[PDB]
Design a binder for this molecule. Structure first.
Ligand SMILES: CC(=O)[C@@]1(O)CC[C@H]2[C@@H]3CCC4=CC(=O)CC[C@]4(C)[C@H]3CC[C@@]21C
Ligand code: NA
Ligand code: NA
Length: 131
């Protein structure tokens, strides 16, 4: 298991389990999350959520109060142990019964310490469905 794979798998587990401190412990201090890449509700300025403090707020907003299910459809290693890509399906269920689901490419990068520096998602609203 490469550092990138272990990091991505650990982040899935901590995400579904709402494990805030475990989730943040996987992040580098200069982490940048772009889920999705470009402007969106989860990426306001379209340039990503930057720094552990900001992704902490991101967690509290979009993960903490949501039942999340992350399915790994397919994994694409690179020739670098520090970078990996996944086809993921992210299903959200909020307090009330409202749901959203999306499927896209997610790329991960870790530093030499094995901490996530980049998480980037390839999808848009057209690929989303709601229930
Ligand atoms: C509530 C929402 O809008 C979403 O459910 C739609 C897509 C979701 C991504 C999917 C990718 C992912 C994989 C991880 O390993 C960490 C958690 C994230 C970033 C996760 C956060 C919540 C998001 C943004
Ligand atoms: Na590094
Ligand atoms: Na550095």
């Amino acid at each position: 298991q490469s550092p990138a794979l272990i990091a991505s798998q650990s982040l899935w587990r901590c995400t579904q389990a709402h494990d805030r401190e475990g989730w943040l412990a996987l992040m580098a201090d200069d982490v940048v999350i772009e889920t999705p890449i470009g402007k969106s509700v989860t990426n306001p300025d379209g340039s990503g959520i930057k720094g552990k403090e900001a992704v902490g707020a991101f967690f509290d907003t979009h993960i903490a109060a949501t039942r999340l299910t992350v399915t790994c459809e397919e994994t694409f290693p690179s020739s670098s142990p520090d970078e990996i890509a996944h086809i993921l399906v992210a299903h959200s269920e909020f307090d009330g019964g409202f749901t959203s689901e999306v499927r896209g490419v997610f790329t991960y990068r870790v530093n030499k310490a094995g901490l996530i520096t980049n998480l980037r998602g390839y999808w848009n609203l057209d690929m989303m469905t709601f229930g």
